[PDB]
Design a protein around this nucleic acid. Structure first.
Ligand code: ZN
Ligand code: ZN
Ligand code: ZN
Ligand code: ZN
Ligand code: ZN
Length: 143
DNA sequence: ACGCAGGTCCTGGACGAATT
DNA sequence: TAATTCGTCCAGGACCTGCG
């Protein structure tokens, strides 16, 4: 108010060209925080610090119930729902319930019938890239 | 058998909150 | 207040497991 600079990638507005230039890094990766180990780039230094633990194996979020540790507090939170039998995610179509939000989302795809992963050796189609990977191991053990 | 699908936890982009 | 950094949500994914 007013803002006359716009990003030609996402359309966001800025009052100063310096602000647009800074923002434009999320699209080009130029000068985004760079991991000294793998040299990948991240949105802010907090996401970089989070990624650092993928190289060290540090798992700083421990479950006080069973003692297992997790890389992220969100993962620990999801894990604790297992102990407590808390399944707040349900398929609206068949009523199946899950403690894990990704298990629920993955399950719901099955009601679409889509099988976009086709074995390049025999043409068998799978809903899950998982199942195709495992399926291809059978072709290799056959050869 | 092995296709199928749920269990589990890792990874990081998205976005508002908190801090500087 | 603006910029940076943080916490968190949430989508997507990899590897595991057991059932029909
Ligand atoms: Zn943009
Ligand atoms: Zn790295
Ligand atoms: Zn636990
Ligand atoms: Zn369902
Ligand atoms: Zn095949």
């Amino acid at each position: 108010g007013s803002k006359s600079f716009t990003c030609d990638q996402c359309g966001k507005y800025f009052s100063q060209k310096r602000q647009l230039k800074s923002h434009y890094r999320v699209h080009t990766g130029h000068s985004l925080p760079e991991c000294s180990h793998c040299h990948r780039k991240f949105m802010d230094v907090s996401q970089l610090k989070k990624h650092l633990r993928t190289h060290t194996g540090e798992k700083p979020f421990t479950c006080e119930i069973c003692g297992k540790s997790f890389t992220a507090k969100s993962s620990l939170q999801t894990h604790i729902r297992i102990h407590r039998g808390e399944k707040p995610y349900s398929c609206s179509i068949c009523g199946k319930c899950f403690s894990d939000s990704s298990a629920k989302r993955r399950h719901c795809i099955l009601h679409t019938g889509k099988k976009p992963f086709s074995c390049p050796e025999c043409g068998l189609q799978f809903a899950r890239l998982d199942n195709l990977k495992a399926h291809l191991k059978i072709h290799s053990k056959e050869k």
